[PDB]
Every structure is written in structure tokens, then in C-alpha cells.
Design a protein around this ligand. Structure first.
Ligand code: IB2
Ligand code: IB2
Lengths: 125, 125
């Protein structure tokens, strides 16, 4: 299961899932700890998600942010939603990019992704 | 009134204000329509705002996003929270940056800011 634009994302890669949201790992992480949080519903633009699915995606992000900046040794994070194609979007889903940051600071197998997912899954126990 | 890091922001510059959030204009907008949304409470890092003040700031942002991409003729927006100094933060407040975008796409007076604020204030009537 798990939708993400035109393609599905395997549970094996999903490390969090809420009532209205779900979080997963990037196949090509800009930096380590790069993880996304997208609404469960596959709406293409922000203003499309209800006001409920707007709290969940961001309350979740909140966690996913603190559970990833931790496990990757960041000292802060950078969040950024690319809404609309003039914004740079390429997957047609609303979704937040959470990246853990380090002072003056990538492709990988499904299996390696399955581990990153598995590792993180633990901080949400 | 209106706190924003070490300094206060004038109402004249605030174009929206909710129960837990407030929105205002930039003195040095990266691009036109650059406007911020910061929690009413002056907490310095994301994970510090309650789960309530996390829904408001982002439900609000939602609007402020659609009321600004509209009035500045954008075809989409770019949202991005700089959380933590390793992220680039410089004002020690949680706060979202909403910028309206246009295809392949600044200092100003309090008064000019007071107008931008005034103009926008109208879409929230
Ligand atoms: N099936 C699938 N499985 C797994 N992944 C998939 C998938 N399908 C698609 N995907 C995957 O899902 C993703 C689709 O997302 P997307 O297409 O919307 C890309 P974006 O939204 O434009 O990116 P950012 O703005 S966040 O990127 C810029 C970030 O770098 C940071 N940054 C860079 N330089 C900085 C600086 N100097 N200072 C501060 N921050 C800086 C910014 O703060 C910002 O957060 C793809 O990765 C795809 O492979
Ligand atoms: N008293 C006061 N009154 C008024 N204003 C005040 C004030 N005090 C402080 N302030 C004001 O309040 C602000 C304090 O905020 P801040 O210090 O946290 C700066 P930041 O968070 O690092 O910025 P962004 O990441 S959003 O910036 C990068 C943005 O550009 C976009 N971008 C750039 N290149 C891009 C590309 N190639 N593709 C997509 N997006 C791109 C990104 O998507 C992103 O949203 C200051 O402006 C200050 O003067």
C-alpha cells in the first residue's frame, strides 16, 4: 500500500503512518536523514488538503523532525514544501521535506532503504 | 504589539492574526509576496510549540499562502521553515516563509510595508 504520486511506496519504506499522514525515506537523499511526510490522501496542491489533514501532516512532521535530527546527529533542521510546479514540485503530491542539519554540511537499494526505515521505526515505538 | 524575536512588529505591518498565530510582511522580501507566519508565542525551535500552535500556524500559513499567491500572480508557492541555526535561522522564532512563485522568476519603507499589509488584509475580510 501507500500512495505517493503516480507510484506506490512499500510499507518496508514507510517508517511512520498516522490516521491522515505517512512518512517514508528518500531513494536519493539530498543529505542523510532526508525523509518525507506526505498526506495520506493524494491531493496535488497544499490548499487542497482539508484543515484536518493539514494539522496531522504537520504535527507528524514535527515528530519525524525530532526523531530524525536526533538519529542523524543534526543540530537543527530545514523544512520545505515545494507547492506547485513553479515551486519545483515533481511528484504531484503535497509533501514536506525534512532534512537534519549539521555544521557546514546517494542512491540506495530498497533493502538499504528498508533498514533506514526500520531503524527510525524504533523511535516511534 | 506583536513579538518577533528580539523585536516587536507593528500592527501596521501585521496583515493577519489568529488565536495562536500572526502573519506579517518582510522588510527585505526575497521576492514579492514574501510574507512570514510565526507562532504568536515566541518559542525558538519548532518542537517547542504545542501541538495546537502547530496546527494554527500551518492552517493559517495555508490561507496566507492562497491569499498571497493570488494577489501577486503566482502559479504556485514555495514554503520553508528554517529551524535551528544550522538550518540558517537568524531570528530566533519559529516562523514559516511563504513566497509566491512565477515562471522562471527590495528594502522598503514602513509605509510601503503598511500598504502591502493593508492590501492583503482585504482578502481576509
Ligand atoms: N517511489 C518513490 N520512492 C522513494 N522516493 C520517491 C519515490 N518517488 C519519488 N520519490 C522522491 O520524493 C521527492 C519528490 O519531492 P519533490 O519533487 O517535490 C522535490 P522539492 O520539493 O523541490 O525539494 P526541496 O525544496 S525540499 O529540496 C531542497 C532542500 O535542500 C535544502 N537546502 C539546500 N541548500 C541549502 C542551503 N544553502 N541552506 C539551507 N537549506 C538548503 C532546503 O532547505 C530544502 O529543504 C524526490 O526526492 C523523489 O526522488
Ligand atoms: N522587525 C522586523 N520587521 C520585518 N521583518 C523582519 C523583522 N525582523 C526580522 N525580519 C525578517 O524575518 C526574516 C527572518 O527569517 P530567517 O532568519 O529565519 C531566514 P530563512 O528561514 O533561512 O529563509 P528561507 O529558507 S525561507 O529563504 C529561502 C527561500 O527562497 C526560496 N528559493 C530560493 N531559491 C530557490 C530555488 N532555486 N528553487 C526554489 N526555491 C528557492 C526557498 O524555497 C525558500 O523559501 C528575515 O527576512 C528578516 O529580514
Amino acid at each position: 500500500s501507500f500512495r505517493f504520486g503516480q507510484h506506490l511506496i512499500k510499507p518496508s519504506v514507510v517508517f511512520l503512518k498516522t490516521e491522515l499522514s505517512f512518512a517514508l525515506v528518500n531513494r536519493k537523499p539530498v543529505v542523510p536523514g532526508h525523509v518525507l511526510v506526505c498526506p495520506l490522501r493524494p491531493v496535488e496542491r497544499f490548499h487542497d488538503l482539508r484543515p484536518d489533514e493539514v494539522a496531522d501532516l504537520f504535527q507528524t512532521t514535527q515528530r519525524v523532525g525530532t526523531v530524525v535530527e536526533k538519529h542523524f546527529h543534526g543540530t537543527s533542521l530545514t523544512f520545505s514544501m515545494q507547492d506547485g510546479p513553479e515551486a519545483g514540485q515533481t511528484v504531484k503530491h503535497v509533501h514536506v521535506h525534512v532534512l537534519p542539519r549539521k555544521a557546514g554540511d546517494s542512491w540506495r537499494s530498497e533493502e538499504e532503504m528498508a533498514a533506514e526505515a526500520a531503524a527510525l521505526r524504533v523511535y516511534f515505538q
